[PDB]
Amino acid sequence: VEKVFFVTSPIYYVNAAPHIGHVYSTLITDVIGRYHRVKGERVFALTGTDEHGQKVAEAAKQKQVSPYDFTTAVAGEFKKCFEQMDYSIDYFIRTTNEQHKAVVKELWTKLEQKGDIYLGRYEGWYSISDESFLTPQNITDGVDKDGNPCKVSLESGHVVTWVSEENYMFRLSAFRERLLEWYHANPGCIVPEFRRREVIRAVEKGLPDLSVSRARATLHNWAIPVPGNPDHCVYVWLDALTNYLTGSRLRVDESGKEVSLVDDFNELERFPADVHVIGKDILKFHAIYWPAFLLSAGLPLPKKIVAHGWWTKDRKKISKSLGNVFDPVEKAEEFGYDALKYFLLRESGFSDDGDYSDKNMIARLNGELADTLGNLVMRCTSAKINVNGEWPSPAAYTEEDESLIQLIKDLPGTADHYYLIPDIQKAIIAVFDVLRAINAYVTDMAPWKLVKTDPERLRTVLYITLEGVRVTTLLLSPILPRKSVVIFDMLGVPEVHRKGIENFEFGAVPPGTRLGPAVEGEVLFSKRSTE
């Protein structure tokens, strides 16, 4: 089926300034979208801010300013950050948006008409910081920021409070068997596999009904009113998850502003998400509640949920109060935007909790970007080796020649599979496995020597090198968007050959193509010292 490839990030609470976790999640969303655009697909990538709720309302109250002013300011910080990070997200959604508000009321009414919302009570634990209902098995003893004994979440370590409230309840218990059929019938729907097994195990054990409203006082009236009952507000998470539906129904102008909300999602051909990128901390909301709501409402389910891990810096937790900051904009100015992105996507896989150190960052920048990629690009574009600044016409291929060609022809299929899991780390490793192979080839053939000794042989070696670099670069263009453009300019690849599955083929750029001009000082990635 041909639709718009729809990929999303979580919408982030605006209780505090943006940081690495938000940047990382949105990066993964951005990269997936970028890859599908280079395949020549229609793409709609979505990110944004989650602006209602007790968490955020109380964050605003502690800064002594109104929730409207606070959310608008912090949302502004998120937008600025994401612009500075040079992403290619199609739309930034805010849950305070009036059109989203309308979609939530629609979904609610659908759930009610379906017979799946009833008036009950929740009596149990709740984490305001996570906006999460917790069973007693998921809480333990801890200390509040007074240092007094309290209860905390086993999930997150945040303070938990006991809630006892007449609330509208969603019939999640009724959806156990249908969710289990869904997980088994679609064994690639949750990635990575151990998180899928986690979800199945949790749902096997049984599901309780879920509170989808709260008394209005508790939310400091900072929430969407329940249709037909203005004493209740819609659960922040039902509101929040609905952002994906809203996004699928907004017509956006070229400026990035929303202009119109269509009645039926089929009009825009986005819904359901092909990939929801999330962090492991919000798996239940996306893999259990969300599909339950969609099943109730009669809407189609997402194709994949991919859940990544958390970051540490110098093997310590990230927090400004502890004395260990990791600012992405700061590190990107220092080391480079594409390089920082490369590092975040290369150092850790979605199954892992990654670790940034300036040491390891410099190791990769120098080792892989500079010595593997950059070195190769400069050799095959050098006036020394490539005396005519053109793509030569290859002569006969030796067997060693063809072993390398095979690797280059095989690469796109392999990278494609990894990008589709999605497992960006393995995609990158795959591409650099091929770059390392081209380097060893170039060392072996010593093309600097061939300029004088065997110019016909040099033609062959230089051509293979140019083409392996082109193909590897194309496949890395979602990871290194700005640098890929430089590389292609240096190689003189025409614009048309910088996109499309046609150009995944070995040989798409014809011999005789002229390289772009050299600069006196230029290097792609500059090595950095190890202080």
Residues that bind ligand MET (CB under 6 A): 10-13, 50, 240-241, 243, 282
Residue 95, helix vs strand vs coil: coil
How far is the C-alpha of 66 from the C-alpha of 268, rounded, in Å? 36
How far is the C-alpha of 420 from the C-alpha of 275, rounded, in Å? 9
Nearer to ligand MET, 82 or 391 (CB): 82
Nearest approach, Cβ of 400 to ligand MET (angstroms)? 51
Question: Which residue sits closest to ligand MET, CB atoms considered?
Answer: 50
Nearer to ligand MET, 285 or 419 (CB): 285
Nearest approach, Cβ of 441 to ligand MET (angstroms)? 46
| Cα torsion through 467, 470, 473, 478, rounded to 10 | -130
Nearest approach, Cβ of 119 to ligand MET (angstroms)? 25
Nearer to ligand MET, 13 or 126 (CB): 13
Nearer to ligand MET, 53 or 412 (CB): 53
Q: Distance of CA 456 to CAs 380, 387, 438, Å?
A: 16, 13, 19
CB 156 within 8 Å of CB 192: no
- For 342, the token pair is 């490369």
Nearer to ligand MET, 19 or 171 (CB): 19
Nearer to ligand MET, 13 or 293 (CB): 13
How far is the C-alpha of 427 from the C-alpha of 513, rounded, in Å? 29
Nearer to ligand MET, 203 or 240 (CB): 240
Nearest approach, Cβ of 241 to ligand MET (angstroms)? 5
- For 272, the token pair is 């359901």
Nearer to ligand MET, 10 or 302 (CB): 10
Cα three-residue angle 138-215-174, rounded to 5 degrees: 55
* Sequential DSSP letters for 462-515: HHHHHHHHHHHHHHHTTTSHHHHHHHHHHHT--GGGGSSGGGGSTT-SPTTPBP
Nearest approach, Cβ of 11 to ligand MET (angstroms)? 5
Tokens 């095989």 -> residue: 410
- For 280, the token pair is 């492991």
Tokens 């109730």 -> residue: 296
Q: List the beta bridge partners of residue 119.
A: 168
Nearer to ligand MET, 284 or 497 (CB): 284
Report which residue type is found at 416.
Answer: D
How far is the C-alpha of 31 from the C-alpha of 86, rounded, in Å? 11
447: CB partners within 8 A, 6+ apart: 379, 385, 458, 461, 462, 465
CB-count exposure of residue 254 (10 Å: 0-12, 13-18, 19+)? exposed
CB 195 within 8 Å of CB 283: yes
Nearest approach, Cβ of 178 to ligand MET (angstroms)? 21
Nearer to ligand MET, 10 or 412 (CB): 10
CB 26 within 8 Å of CB 47: yes
Nearer to ligand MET, 242 or 465 (CB): 242
The H-assigned helical ranges of 311-423 are 328-335, 337-347, 358-364, 375-381, 399-420
Nearest approach, Cβ of 15 to ligand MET (angstroms)? 9
Nearest approach, Cβ of 173 to ligand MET (angstroms)? 22
Nearest approach, Cβ of 291 to ligand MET (angstroms)? 13
